[PDB]
Amino acid sequence: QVIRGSGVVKAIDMNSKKITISHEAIPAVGWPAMTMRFTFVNADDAIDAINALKTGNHVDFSFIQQGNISLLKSINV
Ligand SMILES: [Ag+]
């Protein structure tokens, strides 16, 4: 199940492959607004996140809860 959220990218770590997003509440899945780390898979998945980090723009993103990891699927910027 792909979950769509929005927020501001605050951090990226290319070693841990984590993107930190200050995301809005997601009432669909009962999450409040949080600053939370999402795992990305490919180095090239980071490019859109790096652009969002630079602008600080409020961006769309999507992720899947794949086991007990929040795995990023997209960030539009
Ligand atoms: Ag969260």
CA of 33 to the centre of ligand 1 (A): 7
What is the Cα–Cα distance from 13 to 55, expressed in whole angstroms?
A: 17
**Rounded distance from Cα 55 to ligand 1 centre (Å):** 21
- Structure method: X-ray
Query: Which residues does the annotation place in the binding site?
Result: 23-24, 34, 36, 44, 58
Query: Resolution for this model in angstroms, one decimal place?
Result: 1.7
Q: In terms of CATH architecture, what is 2-75?
A: Beta Barrel (2.40)
Q: Distance from the CA of 44 to the center of ligand 1, in angstroms? A: 23
* Cα of 43 from ligand 1 centre, angstroms: 22
